[PDB]
Amino acid sequence: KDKTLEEILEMMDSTPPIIPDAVIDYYLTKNGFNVADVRVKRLLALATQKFVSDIAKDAYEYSRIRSSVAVSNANNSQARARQLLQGQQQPGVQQISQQQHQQNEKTTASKVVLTVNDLSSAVAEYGLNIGRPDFYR
Amino acid sequence: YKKIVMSLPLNDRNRLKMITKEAGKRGFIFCSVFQARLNNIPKIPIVTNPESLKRVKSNNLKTPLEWSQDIMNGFNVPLASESHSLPDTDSFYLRMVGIAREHGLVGTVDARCVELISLALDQYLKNIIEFTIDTVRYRRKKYSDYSGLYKSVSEMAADKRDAKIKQLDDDKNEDECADEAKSINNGNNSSKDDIGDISMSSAVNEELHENRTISLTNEDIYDSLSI
Amino acid sequence: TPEEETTQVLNGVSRSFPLPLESTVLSSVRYRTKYFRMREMFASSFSVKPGYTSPGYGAIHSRVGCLDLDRTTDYKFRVRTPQP
Amino acid sequence: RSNRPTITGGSAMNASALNTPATTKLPPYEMDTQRVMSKRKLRELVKTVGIDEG
Amino acid sequence: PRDVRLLHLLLASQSIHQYEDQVPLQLMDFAHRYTQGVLKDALVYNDYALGVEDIRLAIAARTQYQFKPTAPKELMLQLAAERNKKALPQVMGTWGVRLPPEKYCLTAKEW
Amino acid sequence: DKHKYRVEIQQMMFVSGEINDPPVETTSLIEDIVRGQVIEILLQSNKTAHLRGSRSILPEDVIFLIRHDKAKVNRLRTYLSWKDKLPWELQFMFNEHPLEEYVHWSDCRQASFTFRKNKRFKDWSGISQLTEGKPHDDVIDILGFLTFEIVCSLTETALKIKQREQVLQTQKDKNPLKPRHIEEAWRVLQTIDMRHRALTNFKGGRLSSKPIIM
């Protein structure tokens, strides 16, 4: 059964969200509308947290598609797990490492960077247009 | 003067360009009274160019005596504020041919773009009405996969005119919906466009107690109140 | 010398003013049609008393624009005025 | 279609047999579209937007 | 950059001598997005029928909904004349401040 | 031209609801809607795959455009299970991984859009017109499954709004699908979600967006 709002506030009575009370209080008194219920503050905290979880997750999808290293790791995942499983004790190393070195300097030197040219497309899905040029001439 | 540190690292081509600009590059207008005048006046297309004259004479399109009548007949349509109903095909056609004669198009308006305009108005007003409807109410059965009857007021179509402000033409219509749609409680809305005068509180004047029967201007407004 | 170059650069920047190529005048349908209708009634009502000519074209009888068939992207045009 | 009732039937001359087409038929017309015509259309537009739907 | 100091000269040409640092950066990142959208819509309008009248169509398409409208004084005068038909209501004569009725005030409300 | 896929559109209409021999105009409108949707899918997928640096459109690159509908991509994964690992998933962040007419109802479901060969599909939809490379490894099978889902969902909502317009008509005074039913089904299926609008609601500017694919 889909949860009614009173059940959600009764659960927010026990489990507070990530964004604490005073941040919600500052954004309240910045936008007017002074409210004295702590459960409405926790509900708006959970709503903002869920919305930015969705935006940052869509940024994660846009940053894992737009790199060849990630799609090649997803393609050759168990194919290189075969090579790792055949990477036994030292008799049995000479028949491997024909492909291990290049993706070794690719996959271990690649960290996932939340980028402006990634988030701008992840929120251009959501209605924005964050146009930052790449040089200024 | 004092901008030697800044006006010097501009390159030589840029500075040789920017010691040449002036006023008198254009052929534009900038007097806003004159811009409003040219947006107000009705204009008819004329011909002076000979190639376009033989191009408009070949396709049996007429002289400007017909396009001026088409301007007048496209203006004389009972536009949709007066009729209180969405317009029909003949009204659409006459208004669009009058507008196309205003812009210069002396050809013929197609018969499918009128139905396209009809479906455009359909989806435009359906978007506006739907995002006014789902704000006075939370439809629990909708927006889900497992009270009574409300009428939308003008204050609500001003209140969700701003919570979702992207949905409008941003022309005159939104300006009047923001400016004049909200009425104070002494507004006298259910009226006949004239009964909010001050003299309709102070006594109908009677008639013809005089040999020359010249009357006063406080009686002329009672005379025009009846119509 | 950089001094005359700097003063003429500042003379160049002090003379450049931009206009917009396309500006959409904020107006209405209804006030335009009602202006036209009232002007048509009171233009058909009275006379002109010309010196030599009256303004207007067929069934306008007022100040009417003279936009050409070409040059529809022009910013100004002629109007009609009673010439003596 | 010729509804002029004057002599010559709205024609240059009064022969009335020489100025009339040979084979004719009935003109197009329509009955009273009152039942199929709705005075208000915007109420129908809000009707197709806002239905009960439970 | 050339346009940071060109924006310095533009800001100084209109007598703006105090500003922050990221203000010409914001002006450049506005102008980039505006010119990119205008040229993309103009490439569409040139595939339809580049040239200057194409740019005029592409900047008249978006003048109609974002920037400051042109010569709005006569529409505002018409609108003022529609509002200034009604004569003024009767005021209190007890030399103070009178409130609206109680339902039209922000007091009889609940959380 | 047009009207190439009329019988197959009718076959896919039969699986959703009743068929009652739909007219030329409904099949033509569904054909033009699907021909537009395929071009938009190929344009968005080619734009996504070129920036990776590979003109060959991968099979996961078109599942990227429908990544929100988890039930539909689970349906695609079960549909790819009779031919006898997504890059954006939770496991694939980290670098290393461990080790009597019922038969007539069924045969219409086996009838597909591009099941036979991609000969009429390639010059009808124009695969070579906008793709810079050679995408055909499994892009045609997904581009058949997506059009089957598009036609199924489109005629489902067109049937439901035809029924609701029928009850509205019989309540106002007191069989086939038309172009207006398909157009209002399109308007129902092309409304942007509320979460994909939230960040432009108080600021007033005309929302430019993309055509939502089913």
Side-chain angles (χ1 to χ4, degrees), chain A, chain B, chain C, chain D, chain E, chain F residues 1-84 86-131 133-214:
Chain A
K1 180 65 182 64
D2 276 19
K3 252 63 180 180
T4 56
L5 206 53
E6 305 308 305
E7 191 72 31
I8 301 183
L9 299 175
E10 207 197 70
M11 194 176 138
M12 281 300 108
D13 175 279
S14 178
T15 77
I18 296 299
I19 317 188
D21 48 343
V23 189
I24 310 298
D25 291 6
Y26 170 69
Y27 274 117
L28 275 168
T29 75
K30 194 203 162 53
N31 301 287
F33 183 70
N34 44 0
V35 79
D37 310 313
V38 74
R39 314 149 298 114
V40 190
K41 301 177 177 188
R42 290 155 161 192
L43 179 132
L44 269 65
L46 192 54
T48 317
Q49 185 211 323
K50 184 245 175 196
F51 203 84
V52 297
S53 167
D54 297 355
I55 294 188
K57 185 159 52 62
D58 294 357
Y60 165 78
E61 333 288 28
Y62 272 63
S63 47
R64 289 309 258 179
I65 278 300
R66 289 172 183 201
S67 66
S68 45
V69 192
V71 290
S72 59
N73 172 46
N75 276 35
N76 318 129
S77 43
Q78 269 208 328
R80 87 184 54 162
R82 291 318 174 276
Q83 292 190 40
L84 264 295
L85 186 45
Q86 297 325 292
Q88 284 97 18
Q89 76 293 335
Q90 306 311 329
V93 64
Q94 59 284 310
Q95 75 271 3
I96 332 174
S97 197
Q98 294 92 0
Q99 197 47 276
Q100 287 181 339
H101 193 276
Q102 294 181 298
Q103 53 97 44
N104 174 228
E105 52 90 18
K106 284 331 272 170
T107 45
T108 63
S110 87
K111 290 205 167 298
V112 287
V113 187
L114 183 58
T115 326
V116 164
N117 268 19
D118 167 88
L119 197 86
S120 86
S121 277
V123 311
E125 184 192 287
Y126 274 64
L128 279 310
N129 185 16
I130 306 189
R132 309 287 309 275
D134 283 334
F135 52 91
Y136 296 95
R137 283 295 289 183
Chain B
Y1 204 87
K2 64 152 294 312
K3 306 157 186 292
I4 308 307
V5 188
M6 208 40 71
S7 159
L8 260 294
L10 301 178
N11 312 326
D12 198 345
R13 39 185 191 273
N14 312 139
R15 298 171 282 169
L16 265 185
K17 163 198 64 164
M18 73 183 52
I19 65 163
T20 319
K21 330 170 177 299
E22 64 184 85
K25 185 181 178 292
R26 311 133 191 94
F28 295 169
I29 61 176
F30 52 91
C31 170
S32 61
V33 180
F34 187 69
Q35 304 190 46
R37 169 63 167 170
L38 295 188
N39 204 61
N40 220 29
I41 194 166
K43 58 208 88 68
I44 56 171
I46 72 160
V47 286
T48 292
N49 177 262
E51 182 259 354
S52 184
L53 180 83
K54 309 305 172 57
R55 187 195 42 88
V56 78
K57 203 170 61 184
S58 89
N59 291 270
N60 91 309
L61 310 170
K62 273 78 69 177
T63 204
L65 274 299
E66 288 63 29
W67 310 325
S68 87
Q69 286 211 342
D70 209 322
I71 290 301
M72 190 181 182
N73 295 327
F75 271 129
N76 285 338
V77 179
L79 80 166
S81 296
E82 319 170 341
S83 67
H84 308 284
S85 69
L86 301 164
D88 280 28
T89 296
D90 47 351
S91 61
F92 278 158
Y93 178 77
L94 284 157
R95 268 164 58 80
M96 285 154 79
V97 180
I99 279 149
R101 292 310 188 274
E102 279 278 37
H103 285 254
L105 259 56
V106 300
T108 77
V109 162
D110 182 89
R112 308 216 48 86
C113 50
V114 168
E115 192 210 8
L116 185 57
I117 284 286
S118 280
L119 203 54
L121 283 180
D122 264 4
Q123 299 201 198
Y124 184 60
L125 283 176
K126 277 157 106 175
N127 202 36
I128 296 183
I129 285 161
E130 176 76 86
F131 277 162
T132 317
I133 274 174
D134 50 13
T135 67
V136 297
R137 202 191 308 263
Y138 176 63
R139 298 179 266 194
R140 213 269 317 271
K141 300 283 188 172
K142 213 195 173 175
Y143 300 122
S144 198
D145 49 354
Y146 166 69
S147 197
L149 174 135
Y150 296 153
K151 46 179 201 75
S152 301
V153 310
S154 175
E155 283 105 357
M156 189 51 65
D159 277 344
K160 312 302 164 247
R161 188 264 302 155
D162 69 84
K164 281 157 267 280
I165 180 168
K166 80 197 74 53
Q167 312 208 88
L168 269 146
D169 202 7
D170 307 303
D171 212 5
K172 179 254 201 187
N173 46 43
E174 189 259 346
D175 273 346
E176 307 272 12
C177 178
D179 279 20
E180 296 180 351
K182 315 161 305 304
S183 293
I184 46 176
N185 295 318
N186 54 4
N188 186 38
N189 45 31
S190 178
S191 85
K192 281 94 189 172
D193 266 334
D194 207 52
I195 65 168
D197 277 345
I198 55 153
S199 317
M200 317 312 171
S201 316
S202 306
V204 185
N205 296 116
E206 296 319 297
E207 283 285 84
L208 215 64
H209 68 305
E210 173 157 9
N211 188 24
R212 56 214 171 99
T213 193
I214 294 97
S215 164
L216 78 162
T217 173
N218 203 11
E219 197 202 304
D220 202 4
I221 66 173
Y222 289 160
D223 204 349
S224 314
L225 163 69
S226 69
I227 302 166
Chain C
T1 171
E3 199 50 48
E4 304 169 324
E5 173 205 50
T6 301
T7 67
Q8 287 202 358
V9 158
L10 301 199
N11 185 15
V13 186
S14 88
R15 283 169 305 190
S16 90
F17 82 110
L19 292 184
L21 296 146
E22 268 299 300
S23 44
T24 77
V25 173
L26 189 70
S27 55
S28 184
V29 192
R30 324 191 313 123
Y31 294 121
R32 187 161 134 85
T33 66
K34 285 171 184 187
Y35 154 73
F36 180 78
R37 281 175 195 162
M38 200 91 51
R39 186 178 31 112
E40 282 307 311
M41 161 186 286
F42 288 92
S44 44
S45 295
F46 299 99
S47 174
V48 173
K49 185 64 176 66
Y52 182 69
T53 50
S54 87
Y57 211 58
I60 286 298
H61 300 285
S62 79
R63 292 183 178 182
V64 62
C66 270
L67 170 85
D68 272 29
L69 183 43
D70 55 57
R71 57 211 66 180
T72 197
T73 48
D74 281 23
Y75 296 95
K76 88 168 79 169
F77 42 86
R78 209 173 144 184
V79 302
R80 262 82 184 254
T81 287
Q83 316 288 146
Chain D
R1 180 165 323 181
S2 90
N3 196 4
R4 207 154 245 211
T6 85
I7 210 141
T8 71
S11 148
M13 76 166 176
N14 69 341
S16 155
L18 305 182
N19 291 113
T20 319
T23 319
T24 68
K25 55 187 174 178
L26 265 69
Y29 80 108
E30 51 174 281
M31 297 300 213
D32 272 359
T33 319
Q34 296 173 90
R35 48 291 168 290
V36 100
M37 266 352 302
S38 261
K39 228 332 132 130
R40 78 302 184 273
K41 304 197 55 198
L42 190 70
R43 320 189 294 215
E44 327 293 323
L45 200 44
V46 190
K47 223 176 305 176
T48 190
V49 175
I51 327 171
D52 192 18
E53 295 186 349
Chain E
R2 176 182 164 259
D3 285 303
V4 167
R5 64 185 69 92
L6 270 172
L7 274 174
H8 195 121
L9 267 299
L10 177 59
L11 282 150
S13 65
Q14 315 277 302
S15 315
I16 303 163
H17 303 304
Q18 278 103 29
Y19 41 86
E20 291 184 354
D21 50 323
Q22 289 169 148
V23 173
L25 187 54
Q26 255 171 335
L27 288 200
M28 284 179 320
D29 296 358
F30 150 76
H32 154 266
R33 218 174 44 183
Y34 174 65
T35 323
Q36 177 157 354
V38 155
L39 281 164
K40 187 177 299 196
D41 301 336
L43 272 179
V44 166
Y45 289 156
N46 198 28
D47 280 15
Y48 184 62
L50 53 90
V52 60
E53 323 293 326
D54 168 40
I55 294 293
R56 290 190 36 169
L57 267 296
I59 70 179
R62 43 175 76 242
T63 300
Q64 301 184 327
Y65 72 96
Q66 54 185 359
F67 285 95
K68 191 61 72 190
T70 320
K73 195 188 151 149
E74 64 98 11
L75 176 70
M76 281 313 152
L77 272 181
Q78 291 272 12
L79 203 156
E82 311 309 308
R83 180 62 83 95
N84 305 6
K85 287 321 196 314
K86 320 282 178 182
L88 293 159
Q90 308 299 321
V91 68
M92 206 183 52
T94 316
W95 274 339
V97 161
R98 186 161 56 167
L99 292 196
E102 194 46 80
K103 51 165 164 172
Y104 298 96
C105 302
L106 315 168
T107 304
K109 292 179 194 297
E110 182 261 359
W111 283 98
Chain F
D1 217 1
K2 266 159 54 55
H3 72 80
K4 311 288 184 67
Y5 277 94
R6 191 246 176 272
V7 193
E8 319 187 33
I9 276 171
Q10 184 263 353
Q11 284 281 108
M12 292 174 314
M13 285 199 214
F14 179 73
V15 179
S16 65
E18 207 203 5
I19 190 68
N20 54 67
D21 197 276
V24 51
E25 306 298 331
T26 300
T27 45
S28 200
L29 207 64
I30 290 185
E31 176 162 327
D32 217 352
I33 285 172
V34 169
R35 193 198 182 269
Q37 277 269 267
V38 164
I39 293 178
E40 299 294 352
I41 283 161
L42 287 173
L43 177 62
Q44 284 159 27
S45 198
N46 193 14
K47 190 183 304 151
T48 307
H50 172 80
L51 166 62
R52 172 169 43 236
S54 282
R55 52 188 73 168
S56 165
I57 288 94
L58 277 75
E60 283 89 0
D61 175 58
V62 285
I63 318 176
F64 176 65
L65 304 185
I66 49 172
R67 69 186 188 275
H68 306 284
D69 207 338
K70 314 190 306 179
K72 212 191 86 146
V73 298
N74 216 344
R75 184 174 319 134
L76 190 139
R77 202 180 324 270
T78 44
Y79 163 81
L80 268 297
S81 313
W82 48 262
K83 291 284 184 58
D84 298 1
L86 294 170
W88 57 79
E89 270 312 304
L90 191 145
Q91 294 204 52
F92 291 87
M93 164 57 220
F94 301 98
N95 314 315
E96 193 269 348
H97 315 284
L99 77 160
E100 186 43 61
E101 299 309 300
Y102 177 76
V103 57
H104 187 40
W105 188 276
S106 52
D107 49 45
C108 279
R109 195 193 288 249
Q110 314 308 123
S112 177
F113 214 85
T114 78
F115 171 64
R116 285 85 54 198
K117 276 300 307 187
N118 45 70
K119 176 193 178 306
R120 192 174 31 161
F121 175 56
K122 173 175 256 282
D123 48 359
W124 161 74
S125 51
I127 306 295
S128 44
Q129 286 287 112
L130 79 163
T131 293
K134 286 318 190 91
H136 36 269
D137 47 9
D138 266 329
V139 65
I140 313 294
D141 167 69
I142 308 299
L143 257 64
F145 176 74
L146 289 200
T147 61
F148 174 62
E149 289 285 321
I150 280 174
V151 172
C152 181
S153 81
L154 179 60
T155 66
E156 192 75 31
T157 176
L159 187 145
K160 287 310 287 166
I161 68 154
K162 181 200 62 179
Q163 170 253 335
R164 291 181 191 195
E165 191 199 326
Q166 166 252 321
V167 308
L168 201 79
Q169 173 53 49
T170 194
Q171 206 178 8
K172 166 181 162 290
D173 219 326
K174 184 193 301 296
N175 303 308
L177 301 166
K178 270 91 174 190
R180 35 183 169 87
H181 297 147
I182 303 299
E183 281 174 332
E184 293 324 285
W186 189 244
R187 197 205 66 88
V188 161
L189 287 183
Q190 288 289 319
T191 41
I192 309 169
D193 204 308
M194 292 298 255
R195 54 178 156 279
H196 301 266
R197 214 207 178 91
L199 286 161
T200 181
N201 48 3
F202 277 97
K203 314 151 300 173
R206 207 168 278 162
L207 179 55
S208 294
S209 65
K210 54 168 296 308
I212 300 108
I213 65 165
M214 284 74 74

